[PDB]
Write a protein that binds this ligand. Structure first.
Ligand SMILES: c1cc(-c2ccc3c(c2)OCO3)n[nH]1
Ligand SMILES: [Zn+2]
Ligand SMILES: [Zn+2]
Ligand SMILES: [Zn+2]
Ligand SMILES: [Zn+2]
Lengths: 69, 68
């Protein structure tokens, strides 16, 4: 039905929000510290000196184990 | 249709996976450091000396700003 199409769209958008903002291909699994923005995969987070969202200095990257992984 | 029910169940499970594993009421927004398990809201994470997934000591809690 049309309701099935609406639910498919909600699921697709939620899943796309879980992907890295830089490569758009891998799941997010890294946090920039101390700001806390958790928007990248490990590879993309590895070479950034400043947060791509807020511009804060990245002191280190924390790996995150999320249930949605 | 039956697919509407199947999709509603998939959405419900994905939403429940984003909720705190302890209180089941608030969204996950905190990481236990250094282990990295990100399974609690800030109120439950503040009250745990040990990670509820791996039992490692919690040195500190990092707030996470997630896209959703
Ligand atoms: C990559 C990103 C996520 C994610 C994103 C938002 C969330 C969340 C998990 O649980 C609470 O709200 N999972 N894998
Ligand atoms: Zn990436
Ligand atoms: Zn940031
Ligand atoms: Zn909680
Ligand atoms: Zn842990």
């Amino acid at each position: 039905s049309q309701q099935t199409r609406v639910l498919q769209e909600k699921l697709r958008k939620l899943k796309e929000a879980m992907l890295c903002m830089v490569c758009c291909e891998e799941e997010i699994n890294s946090t920039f510290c101390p700001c806390g923005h958790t928007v990248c995969c490990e590879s993309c987070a590895a070479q950034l000196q400043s947060c791509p969202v807020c511009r804060s200095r990245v002191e280190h990257v924390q790996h995150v184990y999320l249930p949605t992984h």
